[PDB]
Ligand binder design. Structure first.
Ligand SMILES: O=C(N[C@H]1c2ccccc2C[C@H]1O)[C@H](OCc1ccccc1F)[C@H](O)[C@@H](O)[C@@H](OCc1ccccc1F)C(=O)N[C@H]1c2ccccc2C[C@H]1O
Lengths: 99, 99
């Protein structure tokens, strides 16, 4: 589909069998979701945003459905203000910016 | 043009006769640029992202050229790590997310 930006580009994602709302963010290198339980071991990662850095938990090869499009990749979990779908997964679903 | 997301979507913008590099950021509600002087009165504002909030100066009705496309809107100036073109301006150039 084609999404305009008059409002936040929020879409429904499915992860861990649960539906969540997330933001399609071209400004985010990675994907970070609010605190939740994910399978397997995690590795540490520090990500920097507009207001500084936060420590997150990195999980790899996680299945996540975005607007019905299945993706499998790295998902970060931490104190993010909102669920963010970053470029690592946006590329998997073939998302591009157009104007 | 069509911009893929394998790399950060950086573009050249022109503001106040200055050419700067900025990120097309769908996750950003507003546009915020690194410290610089703009004409007119401004009002303080706090914007929050990953890592917390930062204080910025808000200027209204600023003209900016994004990839040759002229747009008018509010521009925030502050200690942002990178120049950000947010939704308030992305809409004006007809930028959409497609997949
Ligand atoms: O942190 C970022 N990337 C990093 C990131 C993100 C996730 C995972 C990894 C990484 C690494 C970086 O690419 C991006 O910033 C550019 C950016 C790029 C590279 C380096 C530093 C940097 F600041 C990101 O798209 C932010 O813009 C956006 O984050 C999502 C978000 C949405 C809504 C509320 C809170 C919130 F947080 C955000 O903070 N939005 C707020 C904002 C921004 C400008 C003006 C106003 C407002 C109000 C909010 O809409």
């Amino acid at each position: 589909p084609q999404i305009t930006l008059w409002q936040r580009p929020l879409v429904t994602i499915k992860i861990g069998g649960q539906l969540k709302e997330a933001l399609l963010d071209t400004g985010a290198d990675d994907t970070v979701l609010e605190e939740m339980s994910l399978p397997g071991r995690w590795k540490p990662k520090m990500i920097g945003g507009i207001g500084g850095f936060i420590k997150v938990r990195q999980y790899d090869q996680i299945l996540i459905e975005i607007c019905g499009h299945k993706a499998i990749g790295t998902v970060l979990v931490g104190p993010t203000p909102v669920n963010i779908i970053g470029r690592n997964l946006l590329t998997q679903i073939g998302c591009t910016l157009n104007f």
